[PDB]
Amino acid sequence: SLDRVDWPHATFSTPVKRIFDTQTTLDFQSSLAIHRIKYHLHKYTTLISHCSDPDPHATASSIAMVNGLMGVLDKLAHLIDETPPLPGYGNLACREWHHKLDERLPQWLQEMLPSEYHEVVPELQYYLGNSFGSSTRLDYGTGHELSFMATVAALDMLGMFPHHRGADVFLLFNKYYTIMRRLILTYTLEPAGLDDHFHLVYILGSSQWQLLDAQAPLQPREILDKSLVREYKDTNFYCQGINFINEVKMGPFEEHSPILYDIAVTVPRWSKVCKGLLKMYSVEVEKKFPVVQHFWFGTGFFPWVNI
């Protein structure tokens, strides 16, 4: 099935590398793995379009395992000011951060999950542990972001998010993007293009407003305005991503983000931005060898099998 792991016929084991060449990039195109990723990408995008207006002060969901996952993310957050910038390209305190992360994270995910599900930790630990960038190269891109979506897809396949709402994906991904921005700045990470680091923010941000399109607080062309974008950054992912680019990049916008600029200037409806960016996702991340290279496969969540 695409939406559930067949519990408990299923077996979980340490994720392993599979994509290494061209033929293997297309084997991927017809694997249970890619179809599970795609199913969840579409589910989250759809769920979040019902949430044009999340509460920016919300701390909690009434879904237990969203709270659970927030906590593990909170624990990783405080891990940073225990691992302060060395000087220096990516900074090297990051290696230490990742090492502290890799040490404590299986413990954390055991605390987070009920007893029944503990065998799942080797696979979840890999997926969550690869969401925050590369230890050796010290960079962050769309493959790490994918692996944070892989993480939540995997909890979802275990039936941990029943009646998952748009507001629960905003909350989860919102905590996640606040940590990422925090990292990038603190440990000066390198770009691993639409955006130097991200691709889902914009699928999700444009989907938040795709159902209201004409009465959206902002139209696509309005994103070129720096201060309108400030006012909506807490409540809309698209603004949040563009507002980060404004703060970390110093050319005029057309110069440093030509692809986002060419979309703002040319796509008049949010439902169109979303679907365009979705199709780009298949090509610029799912069919891109330098990205999907480092997505590893286990036997339970995202298996290397046909059909």
Side-chain angles (χ1 to χ4, degrees):
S1 333
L2 299 198
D3 72 333
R4 313 157 295 100
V5 158
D6 191 19
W7 189 266
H9 302 345
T11 315
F12 296 85
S13 58
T14 313
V16 121
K17 189 194 170 59
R18 291 288 191 163
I19 289 144
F20 81 101
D21 92 305
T22 293
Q23 184 51 51
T24 212
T25 306
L26 53 132
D27 303 332
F28 187 45
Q29 298 298 316
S30 59
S31 68
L32 189 50
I34 191 166
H35 292 301
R36 285 172 162 171
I37 282 158
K38 274 179 203 288
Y39 179 76
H40 290 85
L41 172 67
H42 283 284
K43 169 193 178 57
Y44 297 155
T45 307
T46 297
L47 283 179
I48 216 176
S49 66
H50 309 322
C51 187
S52 47
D53 197 14
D55 181 351
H57 303 279
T59 270
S61 158
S62 49
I63 306 170
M65 206 84 17
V66 354
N67 295 144
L69 187 61
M70 303 296 274
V72 169
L73 296 170
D74 268 25
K75 289 170 154 122
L76 295 169
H78 307 354
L79 227 49
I80 283 148
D81 41 62
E82 286 152 43
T83 325
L86 268 166
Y89 349 74
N91 177 285
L92 293 139
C94 191
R95 300 237 164 102
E96 299 189 54
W97 184 81
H98 261 106
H99 202 287
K100 286 185 213 172
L101 203 201
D102 282 329
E103 277 192 49
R104 282 166 236 195
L105 178 75
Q107 177 51 41
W108 287 345
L109 296 188
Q110 263 183 37
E111 303 186 334
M112 184 203 65
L113 295 151
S115 276
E116 312 92 85
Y117 292 98
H118 287 351
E119 75 187 48
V120 131
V121 174
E123 281 198 25
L124 263 196
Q125 176 251 23
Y126 168 85
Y127 295 111
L128 193 44
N130 192 60
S131 305
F132 305 97
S134 106
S135 184
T136 54
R137 310 156 207 96
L138 299 187
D139 58 11
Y140 181 87
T142 50
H144 315 286
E145 175 183 49
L146 172 58
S147 134
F148 181 71
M149 204 200 78
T151 309
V152 353
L155 290 163
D156 203 335
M157 280 166 235
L158 293 166
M160 320 265 66
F161 301 136
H163 316 285
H164 204 170
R165 290 176 325 117
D168 304 306
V169 1
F170 173 90
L171 181 75
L172 275 177
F173 282 81
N174 195 21
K175 193 97 190 164
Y176 174 80
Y177 291 120
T178 306
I179 299 168
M180 279 320 304
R181 295 189 234 273
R182 186 148 164 252
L183 289 168
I184 297 184
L185 290 202
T186 298
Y187 304 133
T188 180
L189 306 171
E190 322 152 69
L194 165 101
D195 172 286
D196 297 4
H197 295 106
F198 300 115
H199 197 136
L200 265 149
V201 252
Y202 304 108
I203 292 163
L204 260 24
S206 64
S207 171
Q208 292 180 266
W209 287 327
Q210 80 171 295
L211 297 175
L212 21 162
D213 56 31
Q215 346 108 40
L218 279 201
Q219 302 293 300
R221 77 222 218 185
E222 314 194 68
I223 71 121
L224 308 176
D225 186 311
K226 292 206 188 69
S227 71
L228 271 161
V229 125
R230 302 197 180 99
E231 210 235 306
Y232 285 103
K233 75 176 207 303
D234 293 290
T235 215
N236 180 273
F237 283 132
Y238 209 104
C239 285
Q240 207 172 275
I242 301 288
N243 176 76
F244 193 51
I245 303 188
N246 287 339
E247 284 171 358
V248 87
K249 287 193 161 193
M250 210 182 60
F253 199 81
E254 174 156 35
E255 257 110 48
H256 64 240
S257 337
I259 290 165
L260 292 155
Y261 180 101
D262 289 345
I263 285 168
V265 106
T266 238
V267 198
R269 289 143 61 40
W270 291 112
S271 59
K272 287 194 200 323
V273 177
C274 197
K275 89 173 166 226
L277 295 177
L278 276 156
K279 288 163 191 271
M280 268 184 61
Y281 195 80
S282 280
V283 174
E284 287 315 290
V285 339
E286 244 72 88
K287 281 167 59 193
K288 271 283 278 85
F289 175 88
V291 174
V292 295
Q293 200 185 357
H294 302 304
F295 183 89
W296 293 11
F297 309 84
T299 22
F301 292 123
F302 302 101
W304 187 253
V305 327
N306 216 144
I307 282 137

mmCIF file of all heavy atoms in Angstrom, residues 13-55:
data_model
loop_
_atom_site.group_PDB
_atom_site.id
_atom_site.type_symbol
_atom_site.label_atom_id
_atom_site.label_comp_id
_atom_site.label_asym_id
_atom_site.label_seq_id
_atom_site.Cartn_x
_atom_site.Cartn_y
_atom_site.Cartn_z
ATOM 1 N N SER A 13 14.965 -2.277 9.152
ATOM 2 C CA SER A 13 16.377 -2.610 9.211
ATOM 3 C C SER A 13 17.068 -1.363 8.738
ATOM 4 O O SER A 13 16.409 -0.485 8.157
ATOM 5 C CB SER A 13 16.700 -3.746 8.246
ATOM 6 O OG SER A 13 16.339 -3.362 6.928
ATOM 7 N N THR A 14 18.380 -1.282 8.989
ATOM 8 C CA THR A 14 19.141 -0.061 8.760
ATOM 9 C C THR A 14 19.102 0.292 7.269
ATOM 10 O O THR A 14 19.396 -0.572 6.409
ATOM 11 C CB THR A 14 20.580 -0.222 9.257
ATOM 12 O OG1 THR A 14 20.535 -0.788 10.567
ATOM 13 C CG2 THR A 14 21.331 1.094 9.293
ATOM 14 N N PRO A 15 18.699 1.549 6.956
ATOM 15 C CA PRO A 15 18.710 2.042 5.583
ATOM 16 C C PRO A 15 20.113 2.039 4.943
ATOM 17 O O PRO A 15 21.125 2.285 5.601
ATOM 18 C CB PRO A 15 18.153 3.466 5.725
ATOM 19 C CG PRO A 15 17.406 3.437 6.978
ATOM 20 C CD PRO A 15 18.183 2.573 7.877
ATOM 21 N N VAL A 16 20.138 1.795 3.643
ATOM 22 C CA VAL A 16 21.366 1.470 2.927
ATOM 23 C C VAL A 16 21.314 2.196 1.567
ATOM 24 O O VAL A 16 20.215 2.503 1.069
ATOM 25 C CB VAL A 16 21.438 -0.115 2.838
ATOM 26 C CG1 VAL A 16 21.502 -0.617 1.437
ATOM 27 C CG2 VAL A 16 22.503 -0.737 3.834
ATOM 28 N N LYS A 17 22.478 2.493 0.987
ATOM 29 C CA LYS A 17 22.548 3.204 -0.302
ATOM 30 C C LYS A 17 22.177 2.339 -1.511
ATOM 31 O O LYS A 17 22.611 1.197 -1.631
ATOM 32 C CB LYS A 17 23.934 3.793 -0.525
ATOM 33 C CG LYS A 17 24.071 4.742 -1.719
ATOM 34 C CD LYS A 17 25.532 4.961 -2.006
ATOM 35 C CE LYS A 17 25.765 5.679 -3.296
ATOM 36 N NZ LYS A 17 25.088 7.015 -3.260
ATOM 37 N N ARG A 18 21.407 2.908 -2.435
ATOM 38 C CA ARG A 18 20.957 2.161 -3.596
ATOM 39 C C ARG A 18 21.170 2.890 -4.899
ATOM 40 O O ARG A 18 21.504 2.257 -5.911
ATOM 41 C CB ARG A 18 19.471 1.825 -3.462
ATOM 42 C CG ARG A 18 19.167 0.800 -2.366
ATOM 43 C CD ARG A 18 19.624 -0.576 -2.763
ATOM 44 N NE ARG A 18 19.088 -1.529 -1.815
ATOM 45 C CZ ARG A 18 19.030 -2.825 -2.066
ATOM 46 N NH1 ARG A 18 19.478 -3.284 -3.237
ATOM 47 N NH2 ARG A 18 18.512 -3.658 -1.174
ATOM 48 N N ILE A 19 20.937 4.206 -4.881
ATOM 49 C CA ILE A 19 21.174 5.018 -6.069
ATOM 50 C C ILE A 19 22.638 5.409 -6.189
ATOM 51 O O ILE A 19 23.195 6.072 -5.319
ATOM 52 C CB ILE A 19 20.224 6.229 -6.178
ATOM 53 C CG1 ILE A 19 18.792 5.758 -6.501
ATOM 54 C CG2 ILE A 19 20.648 7.095 -7.293
ATOM 55 C CD1 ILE A 19 17.652 6.564 -5.829
ATOM 56 N N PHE A 20 23.256 4.951 -7.277
ATOM 57 C CA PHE A 20 24.699 5.165 -7.546
ATOM 58 C C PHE A 20 25.081 5.487 -8.987
ATOM 59 O O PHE A 20 26.263 5.721 -9.267
ATOM 60 C CB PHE A 20 25.543 3.960 -7.047
ATOM 61 C CG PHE A 20 25.580 2.748 -7.989
ATOM 62 C CD1 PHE A 20 26.678 2.519 -8.822
ATOM 63 C CD2 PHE A 20 24.576 1.775 -7.963
ATOM 64 C CE1 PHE A 20 26.768 1.357 -9.638
ATOM 65 C CE2 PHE A 20 24.645 0.616 -8.792
ATOM 66 C CZ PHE A 20 25.744 0.421 -9.623
ATOM 67 N N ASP A 21 24.102 5.484 -9.884
ATOM 68 C CA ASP A 21 24.356 5.640 -11.319
ATOM 69 C C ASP A 21 23.024 5.981 -11.974
ATOM 70 O O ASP A 21 22.050 6.157 -11.253
ATOM 71 C CB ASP A 21 25.070 4.390 -11.936
ATOM 72 C CG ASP A 21 24.099 3.337 -12.497
ATOM 73 O OD1 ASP A 21 23.201 2.856 -11.772
ATOM 74 O OD2 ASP A 21 24.191 3.014 -13.711
ATOM 75 N N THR A 22 22.996 6.082 -13.305
ATOM 76 C CA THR A 22 21.806 6.431 -14.100
ATOM 77 C C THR A 22 20.698 5.373 -14.089
ATOM 78 O O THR A 22 19.551 5.678 -13.794
ATOM 79 C CB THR A 22 22.205 6.747 -15.575
ATOM 80 O OG1 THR A 22 22.984 7.945 -15.581
ATOM 81 C CG2 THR A 22 20.986 6.924 -16.490
ATOM 82 N N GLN A 23 21.035 4.133 -14.428
ATOM 83 C CA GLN A 23 20.047 3.054 -14.430
ATOM 84 C C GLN A 23 19.369 3.006 -13.041
ATOM 85 O O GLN A 23 18.194 2.726 -12.883
ATOM 86 C CB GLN A 23 20.720 1.712 -14.757
ATOM 87 C CG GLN A 23 19.755 0.534 -14.873
ATOM 88 C CD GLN A 23 18.594 0.826 -15.813
ATOM 89 O OE1 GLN A 23 18.790 1.255 -16.960
ATOM 90 N NE2 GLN A 23 17.368 0.613 -15.327
ATOM 91 N N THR A 24 20.138 3.305 -12.025
ATOM 92 C CA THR A 24 19.638 3.149 -10.712
ATOM 93 C C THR A 24 18.748 4.346 -10.312
ATOM 94 O O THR A 24 17.812 4.185 -9.477
ATOM 95 C CB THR A 24 20.801 2.812 -9.786
ATOM 96 O OG1 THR A 24 20.328 1.968 -8.758
ATOM 97 C CG2 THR A 24 21.442 4.013 -9.230
ATOM 98 N N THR A 25 18.997 5.510 -10.946
ATOM 99 C CA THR A 25 18.105 6.684 -10.822
ATOM 100 C C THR A 25 16.717 6.416 -11.426
ATOM 101 O O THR A 25 15.718 6.926 -10.889
ATOM 102 C CB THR A 25 18.721 7.984 -11.399
ATOM 103 O OG1 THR A 25 19.989 8.206 -10.795
ATOM 104 C CG2 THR A 25 17.865 9.218 -11.102
ATOM 105 N N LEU A 26 16.638 5.622 -12.509
ATOM 106 C CA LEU A 26 15.320 5.194 -13.002
ATOM 107 C C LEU A 26 14.690 3.984 -12.373
ATOM 108 O O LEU A 26 13.456 3.925 -12.326
ATOM 109 C CB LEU A 26 15.159 5.126 -14.516
ATOM 110 C CG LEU A 26 16.104 4.361 -15.398
ATOM 111 C CD1 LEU A 26 15.287 3.484 -16.368
ATOM 112 C CD2 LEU A 26 16.998 5.418 -16.131
ATOM 113 N N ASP A 27 15.471 3.024 -11.882
ATOM 114 C CA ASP A 27 14.856 2.010 -11.020
ATOM 115 C C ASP A 27 14.001 2.750 -9.942
ATOM 116 O O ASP A 27 12.809 2.468 -9.780
ATOM 117 C CB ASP A 27 15.893 1.098 -10.360
ATOM 118 C CG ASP A 27 16.807 0.373 -11.366
ATOM 119 O OD1 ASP A 27 16.375 0.126 -12.511
ATOM 120 O OD2 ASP A 27 17.970 0.041 -10.998
ATOM 121 N N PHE A 28 14.610 3.726 -9.262
ATOM 122 C CA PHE A 28 13.936 4.556 -8.319
ATOM 123 C C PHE A 28 12.629 5.081 -8.825
ATOM 124 O O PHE A 28 11.732 5.312 -8.043
ATOM 125 C CB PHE A 28 14.801 5.754 -7.955
ATOM 126 C CG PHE A 28 14.245 6.602 -6.832
ATOM 127 C CD1 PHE A 28 13.733 6.011 -5.658
ATOM 128 C CD2 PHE A 28 14.270 7.995 -6.917
ATOM 129 C CE1 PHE A 28 13.257 6.805 -4.586
ATOM 130 C CE2 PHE A 28 13.798 8.803 -5.869
ATOM 131 C CZ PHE A 28 13.285 8.215 -4.700
ATOM 132 N N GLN A 29 12.492 5.312 -10.115
ATOM 133 C CA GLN A 29 11.296 6.030 -10.580
ATOM 134 C C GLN A 29 10.056 5.127 -10.524
ATOM 135 O O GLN A 29 8.911 5.580 -10.586
ATOM 136 C CB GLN A 29 11.503 6.631 -11.966
ATOM 137 C CG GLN A 29 12.615 7.649 -12.014
ATOM 138 C CD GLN A 29 12.381 8.873 -11.126
ATOM 139 O OE1 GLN A 29 11.278 9.433 -11.087
ATOM 140 N NE2 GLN A 29 13.427 9.313 -10.436
ATOM 141 N N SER A 30 10.285 3.849 -10.359
ATOM 142 C CA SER A 30 9.158 2.963 -10.277
ATOM 143 C C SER A 30 9.214 2.088 -9.017
ATOM 144 O O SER A 30 8.761 0.981 -9.043
ATOM 145 C CB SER A 30 9.081 2.140 -11.582
ATOM 146 O OG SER A 30 10.285 1.414 -11.734
ATOM 147 N N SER A 31 9.770 2.603 -7.920
ATOM 148 C CA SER A 31 9.852 1.853 -6.673
ATOM 149 C C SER A 31 8.746 2.227 -5.703
ATOM 150 O O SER A 31 8.304 3.370 -5.657
ATOM 151 C CB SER A 31 11.175 2.135 -5.973
ATOM 152 O OG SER A 31 11.223 3.472 -5.499
ATOM 153 N N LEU A 32 8.344 1.274 -4.884
ATOM 154 C CA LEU A 32 7.430 1.546 -3.835
ATOM 155 C C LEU A 32 7.871 2.803 -3.066
ATOM 156 O O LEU A 32 7.013 3.529 -2.519
ATOM 157 C CB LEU A 32 7.357 0.339 -2.909
ATOM 158 C CG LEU A 32 6.251 0.416 -1.860
ATOM 159 C CD1 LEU A 32 4.910 0.775 -2.474
ATOM 160 C CD2 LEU A 32 6.176 -0.866 -1.043
ATOM 161 N N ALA A 33 9.187 3.074 -3.046
ATOM 162 C CA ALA A 33 9.722 4.207 -2.265
ATOM 163 C C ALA A 33 9.183 5.477 -2.862
ATOM 164 O O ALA A 33 8.504 6.237 -2.168
ATOM 165 C CB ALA A 33 11.258 4.232 -2.218
ATOM 166 N N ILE A 34 9.416 5.678 -4.155
ATOM 167 C CA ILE A 34 9.050 6.959 -4.757
ATOM 168 C C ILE A 34 7.540 7.177 -4.712
ATOM 169 O O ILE A 34 7.091 8.289 -4.520
ATOM 170 C CB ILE A 34 9.646 7.210 -6.188
ATOM 171 C CG1 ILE A 34 9.440 8.665 -6.597
ATOM 172 C CG2 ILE A 34 9.012 6.345 -7.204
ATOM 173 C CD1 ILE A 34 10.249 9.092 -7.777
ATOM 174 N N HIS A 35 6.763 6.117 -4.869
ATOM 175 C CA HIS A 35 5.320 6.256 -4.853
ATOM 176 C C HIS A 35 4.776 6.611 -3.489
ATOM 177 O O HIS A 35 3.781 7.336 -3.398
ATOM 178 C CB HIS A 35 4.633 5.050 -5.511
ATOM 179 C CG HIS A 35 4.880 4.984 -6.995
ATOM 180 N ND1 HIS A 35 4.523 6.006 -7.856
ATOM 181 C CD2 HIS A 35 5.507 4.059 -7.760
ATOM 182 C CE1 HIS A 35 4.888 5.697 -9.086
ATOM 183 N NE2 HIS A 35 5.473 4.513 -9.058
ATOM 184 N N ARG A 36 5.444 6.147 -2.438
ATOM 185 C CA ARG A 36 5.108 6.550 -1.066
ATOM 186 C C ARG A 36 5.475 7.995 -0.771
ATOM 187 O O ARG A 36 4.737 8.693 -0.071
ATOM 188 C CB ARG A 36 5.724 5.619 -0.024
ATOM 189 C CG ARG A 36 5.000 4.271 0.065
ATOM 190 C CD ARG A 36 5.745 3.273 0.980
ATOM 191 N NE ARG A 36 4.832 2.198 1.384
ATOM 192 C CZ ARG A 36 5.183 1.080 2.032
ATOM 193 N NH1 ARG A 36 6.453 0.862 2.378
ATOM 194 N NH2 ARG A 36 4.252 0.166 2.334
ATOM 195 N N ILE A 37 6.612 8.445 -1.296
ATOM 196 C CA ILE A 37 7.022 9.838 -1.162
ATOM 197 C C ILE A 37 5.983 10.755 -1.860
ATOM 198 O O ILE A 37 5.594 11.806 -1.321
ATOM 199 C CB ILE A 37 8.453 10.055 -1.765
ATOM 200 C CG1 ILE A 37 9.550 9.554 -0.808
ATOM 201 C CG2 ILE A 37 8.679 11.516 -2.128
ATOM 202 C CD1 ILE A 37 10.899 9.221 -1.511
ATOM 203 N N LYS A 38 5.558 10.356 -3.055
ATOM 204 C CA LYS A 38 4.685 11.151 -3.850
ATOM 205 C C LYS A 38 3.286 11.235 -3.261
ATOM 206 O O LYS A 38 2.739 12.308 -3.178
ATOM 207 C CB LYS A 38 4.615 10.600 -5.258
ATOM 208 C CG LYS A 38 5.694 11.092 -6.203
ATOM 209 C CD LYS A 38 5.454 10.391 -7.596
ATOM 210 C CE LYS A 38 6.720 10.315 -8.469
ATOM 211 N NZ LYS A 38 7.128 11.654 -9.031
ATOM 212 N N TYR A 39 2.699 10.097 -2.900
ATOM 213 C CA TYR A 39 1.484 10.053 -2.110
ATOM 214 C C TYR A 39 1.440 11.083 -0.963
ATOM 215 O O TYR A 39 0.536 11.910 -0.933
ATOM 216 C CB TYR A 39 1.298 8.649 -1.540
ATOM 217 C CG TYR A 39 0.059 8.548 -0.696
ATOM 218 C CD1 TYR A 39 -1.210 8.485 -1.299
ATOM 219 C CD2 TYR A 39 0.136 8.573 0.728
ATOM 220 C CE1 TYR A 39 -2.378 8.425 -0.500
ATOM 221 C CE2 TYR A 39 -1.031 8.524 1.529
ATOM 222 C CZ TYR A 39 -2.265 8.441 0.907
ATOM 223 O OH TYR A 39 -3.409 8.370 1.662
ATOM 224 N N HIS A 40 2.418 11.028 -0.045
ATOM 225 C CA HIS A 40 2.576 11.997 1.075
ATOM 226 C C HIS A 40 2.882 13.472 0.761
ATOM 227 O O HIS A 40 2.452 14.390 1.495
ATOM 228 C CB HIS A 40 3.579 11.477 2.096
ATOM 229 C CG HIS A 40 3.067 10.309 2.868
ATOM 230 N ND1 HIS A 40 3.157 9.020 2.404
ATOM 231 C CD2 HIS A 40 2.416 10.237 4.044
ATOM 232 C CE1 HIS A 40 2.610 8.194 3.274
ATOM 233 N NE2 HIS A 40 2.162 8.909 4.286
ATOM 234 N N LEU A 41 3.634 13.700 -0.301
ATOM 235 C CA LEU A 41 3.840 15.037 -0.802
ATOM 236 C C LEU A 41 2.491 15.602 -1.207
ATOM 237 O O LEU A 41 2.188 16.760 -0.947
ATOM 238 C CB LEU A 41 4.802 15.012 -2.003
ATOM 239 C CG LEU A 41 4.985 16.329 -2.762
ATOM 240 C CD1 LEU A 41 5.677 17.370 -1.939
ATOM 241 C CD2 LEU A 41 5.761 16.069 -4.027
ATOM 242 N N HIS A 42 1.654 14.784 -1.831
ATOM 243 C CA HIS A 42 0.395 15.299 -2.286
ATOM 244 C C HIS A 42 -0.589 15.421 -1.157
ATOM 245 O O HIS A 42 -1.447 16.267 -1.170
ATOM 246 C CB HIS A 42 -0.138 14.437 -3.393
ATOM 247 C CG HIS A 42 0.543 14.674 -4.694
ATOM 248 N ND1 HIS A 42 0.289 15.780 -5.469
ATOM 249 C CD2 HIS A 42 1.482 13.957 -5.359
ATOM 250 C CE1 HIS A 42 1.029 15.734 -6.564
ATOM 251 N NE2 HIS A 42 1.777 14.646 -6.510
ATOM 252 N N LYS A 43 -0.476 14.561 -0.169
ATOM 253 C CA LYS A 43 -1.404 14.596 0.941
ATOM 254 C C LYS A 43 -1.104 15.875 1.753
ATOM 255 O O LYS A 43 -1.976 16.612 2.101
ATOM 256 C CB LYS A 43 -1.255 13.290 1.742
ATOM 257 C CG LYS A 43 -1.948 13.203 3.120
ATOM 258 C CD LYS A 43 -1.434 11.982 3.923
ATOM 259 C CE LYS A 43 -2.046 11.857 5.310
ATOM 260 N NZ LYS A 43 -3.508 11.796 5.126
ATOM 261 N N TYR A 44 0.153 16.158 2.007
ATOM 262 C CA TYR A 44 0.485 17.300 2.833
ATOM 263 C C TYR A 44 0.151 18.613 2.158
ATOM 264 O O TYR A 44 -0.366 19.563 2.824
ATOM 265 C CB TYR A 44 1.962 17.227 3.270
ATOM 266 C CG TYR A 44 2.179 16.001 4.124
ATOM 267 C CD1 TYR A 44 3.432 15.409 4.228
ATOM 268 C CD2 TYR A 44 1.088 15.405 4.805
ATOM 269 C CE1 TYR A 44 3.621 14.282 5.002
ATOM 270 C CE2 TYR A 44 1.257 14.271 5.552
ATOM 271 C CZ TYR A 44 2.547 13.736 5.650
ATOM 272 O OH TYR A 44 2.751 12.646 6.407
ATOM 273 N N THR A 45 0.451 18.670 0.854
ATOM 274 C CA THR A 45 0.132 19.826 0.053
ATOM 275 C C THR A 45 -1.376 20.042 0.071
ATOM 276 O O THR A 45 -1.848 21.132 0.348
ATOM 277 C CB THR A 45 0.672 19.650 -1.343
ATOM 278 O OG1 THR A 45 2.071 19.336 -1.250
ATOM 279 C CG2 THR A 45 0.502 20.918 -2.159
ATOM 280 N N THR A 46 -2.150 18.992 -0.148
ATOM 281 C CA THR A 46 -3.605 19.123 -0.093
ATOM 282 C C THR A 46 -4.081 19.527 1.286
ATOM 283 O O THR A 46 -4.870 20.449 1.372
ATOM 284 C CB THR A 46 -4.342 17.842 -0.584
ATOM 285 O OG1 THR A 46 -4.022 17.630 -1.957
ATOM 286 C CG2 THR A 46 -5.822 17.974 -0.443
ATOM 287 N N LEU A 47 -3.612 18.860 2.352
ATOM 288 C CA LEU A 47 -4.069 19.168 3.712
ATOM 289 C C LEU A 47 -3.782 20.621 4.064
ATOM 290 O O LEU A 47 -4.611 21.296 4.652
ATOM 291 C CB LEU A 47 -3.395 18.285 4.736
ATOM 292 C CG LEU A 47 -3.838 16.827 4.917
ATOM 293 C CD1 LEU A 47 -2.944 16.205 6.018
ATOM 294 C CD2 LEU A 47 -5.365 16.747 5.230
ATOM 295 N N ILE A 48 -2.620 21.130 3.659
ATOM 296 C CA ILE A 48 -2.264 22.469 4.058
ATOM 297 C C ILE A 48 -3.020 23.552 3.297
ATOM 298 O O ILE A 48 -3.037 24.708 3.729
ATOM 299 C CB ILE A 48 -0.736 22.728 4.018
ATOM 300 C CG1 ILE A 48 -0.351 23.662 5.196
ATOM 301 C CG2 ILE A 48 -0.313 23.238 2.651
ATOM 302 C CD1 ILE A 48 1.127 23.926 5.348
ATOM 303 N N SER A 49 -3.633 23.224 2.167
ATOM 304 C CA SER A 49 -4.394 24.253 1.467
ATOM 305 C C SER A 49 -5.670 24.605 2.236
ATOM 306 O O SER A 49 -6.349 25.536 1.875
ATOM 307 C CB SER A 49 -4.735 23.819 0.068
ATOM 308 O OG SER A 49 -5.622 22.739 0.130
ATOM 309 N N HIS A 50 -5.996 23.854 3.284
ATOM 310 C CA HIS A 50 -7.204 24.108 4.078
ATOM 311 C C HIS A 50 -6.779 25.021 5.219
ATOM 312 O O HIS A 50 -7.582 25.308 6.078
ATOM 313 C CB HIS A 50 -7.744 22.836 4.749
ATOM 314 C CG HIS A 50 -7.932 21.658 3.841
ATOM 315 N ND1 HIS A 50 -8.396 21.762 2.548
ATOM 316 C CD2 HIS A 50 -7.793 20.335 4.074
ATOM 317 C CE1 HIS A 50 -8.486 20.556 2.005
ATOM 318 N NE2 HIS A 50 -8.127 19.674 2.914
ATOM 319 N N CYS A 51 -5.508 25.438 5.228
ATOM 320 C CA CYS A 51 -4.914 26.179 6.327
ATOM 321 C C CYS A 51 -4.181 27.452 5.824
ATOM 322 O O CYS A 51 -2.954 27.582 5.897
ATOM 323 C CB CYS A 51 -3.971 25.260 7.108
ATOM 324 S SG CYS A 51 -3.329 26.042 8.607
ATOM 325 N N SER A 52 -4.954 28.386 5.291
ATOM 326 C CA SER A 52 -4.412 29.621 4.726
ATOM 327 C C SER A 52 -3.971 30.520 5.843
ATOM 328 O O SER A 52 -3.212 31.466 5.637
ATOM 329 C CB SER A 52 -5.458 30.337 3.861
ATOM 330 O OG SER A 52 -6.721 30.441 4.494
ATOM 331 N N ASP A 53 -4.427 30.191 7.044
ATOM 332 C CA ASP A 53 -4.286 31.097 8.155
ATOM 333 C C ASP A 53 -3.971 30.397 9.489
ATOM 334 O O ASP A 53 -4.792 30.430 10.423
ATOM 335 C CB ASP A 53 -5.573 31.873 8.280
ATOM 336 C CG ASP A 53 -5.403 33.099 9.118
ATOM 337 O OD1 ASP A 53 -4.214 33.458 9.361
ATOM 338 O OD2 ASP A 53 -6.438 33.695 9.539
ATOM 339 N N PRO A 54 -2.773 29.783 9.603
ATOM 340 C CA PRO A 54 -2.463 29.089 10.847
ATOM 341 C C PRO A 54 -2.287 30.099 11.976
ATOM 342 O O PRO A 54 -2.002 31.255 11.718
ATOM 343 C CB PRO A 54 -1.131 28.412 10.530
ATOM 344 C CG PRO A 54 -0.471 29.354 9.562
ATOM 345 C CD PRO A 54 -1.625 29.758 8.668
ATOM 346 N N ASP A 55 -2.485 29.655 13.205
ATOM 347 C CA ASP A 55 -2.258 30.476 14.370
ATOM 348 C C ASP A 55 -0.756 30.514 14.609
ATOM 349 O O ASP A 55 -0.141 29.485 14.893
ATOM 350 C CB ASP A 55 -2.972 29.834 15.553
ATOM 351 C CG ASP A 55 -2.829 30.619 16.853
ATOM 352 O OD1 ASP A 55 -2.036 31.580 16.901
ATOM 353 O OD2 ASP A 55 -3.504 30.253 17.854
#
